[PDB]
């Protein structure tokens, strides 16, 4: 059957760098699923206000994806927004805090809990992959030797990264250790807007393969968790040197993603998936056999009104994309 992309919007509290410089809250919320900026409606599935906690966003966004992955479908969650918007906070956040943990730790804990709650005749294999995109190069965040990798195609024409470290796991502790090791190798630079701005598009992959002993039925599952970098402007970021090169590549990749989203929204034919590595990897996520939810994080200050409008328009166009999701029966 066909299912739509579930775009969800999150507005963070105003940060110190904006509250101390003549800024005003421009976002006005009505109902439970609409946001009004400069008297222009923008309707999404669920719009989270400033004070929304991590449990709320996880329960309203990603709890369905855990059950979908275990049942046999595929899932994808990725965050899009401006610099210092809340993508890293929404996805990962503080890794060990019971109240501040983001989407990834809650997803892994709930996937293990549902596995424990399943029937006794089933058997599961879980593998974890973690890589990033930097200067149009795919680097493995678990083994530094893999300086760059290649995106190939499968028999049924679904792209995938070749050579990424597939580490098997048994308990959530190993998953958390893998996440920590991947995060420590991720690239972080200090810009004016954000002190810990991420300069790479991190991707988290877990395959939950399912086998049944009695009925010999084998089911697959591919869950993608992506933390994109934000669009940056030299006037606000003040980048000079390596940071400027990172900003150039980040802007190019995000423009490619916007192009593919617009192409899917307009019902075109070419749907340019091949213009960037990120658009290649998430091809099945956007236009194939995946139930993907986009979590757009947007700054509510008057200083980022144009960027916030661009992000909301990107989310709005993505809501009309239709995906064809079918159970992966091997």
């Amino acid at each position: 059957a066909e299912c739509n992309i579930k775009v969800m919007c999150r507005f963070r509290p105003l940060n110190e760098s904006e509250v101390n410089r003549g800024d005003k809250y421009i976002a006005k919320f009505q109902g439970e699923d609409t946001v009004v900026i400069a008297s222009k409606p923008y309707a999404f599935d669920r719009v989270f206000q400033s004070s929304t906690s991590q449990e709320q966003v996880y329960n309203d966004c990603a709890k369905k994806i855990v059950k979908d992955v275990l049942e046999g479908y595929n899932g994808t969650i990725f965050a899009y927004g401006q610099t210092s918007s809340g993508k890293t906070h929404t996805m990962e956040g503080k890794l060990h805090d019971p109240e501040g943990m983001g989407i990834i730790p809650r997803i892994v804990q709930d996937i293990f809990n549902y596995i424990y709650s399943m029937d006794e005749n089933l058997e599961f294999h879980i593998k974890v992959s973690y890589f990033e995109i930097y200067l149009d190069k795919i680097r493995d965040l678990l083994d530094v030797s893999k300086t760059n990798l290649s995106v190939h195609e499968d028999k049924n024409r679904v792209p995938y990264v070749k050579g990424c470290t597939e580490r098997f796991v048994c308990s959530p502790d190993e998953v958390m250790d893998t996440i920590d090791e991947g995060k420590s190798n991720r690239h972080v630079a200090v810009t004016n807007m954000n002190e810990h701005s991420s300069r790479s598009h991190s991707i988290f992959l877990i395959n939950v393969k399912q086998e049944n002993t009695q009925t010999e039925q084998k089911l697959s599952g591919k869950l993608y968790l992506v933390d994109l970098a934000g669009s940056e402007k030299v006037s606000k970021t003040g980048a000079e040197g390596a940071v400027l090169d990172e900003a150039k590549n980040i802007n190019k990749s995000l423009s490619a993603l916007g192009n593919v989203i617009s192409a899917l929204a307009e019902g075109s034919t070419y749907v340019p998936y091949r213009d960037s590595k990120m658009t290649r990897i998430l091809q099945d996520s956007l236009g194939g056999n995946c139930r993907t939810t986009i979590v757009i994080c947007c700054s509510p200050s008057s200083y980022n009104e144009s960027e916030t409008k661009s992000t909301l328009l990107f989310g709005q166009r993505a809501k009309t994309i239709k995906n064809t999701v079918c159970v992966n029966v091997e």
């Binding site: 596995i115 424990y116 709650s117 399943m118 029937d119 006794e120 089933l122 058997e123 599961f124 294999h125 879980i126 098997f168 796991v169 048994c170």
Partner: peptide, 6 residues
């Protein structure tokens, strides 16, 4: 190979 079971 490290399977998990309920």
């Amino acid at each position: 190979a490290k399977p998990i079971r309920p």
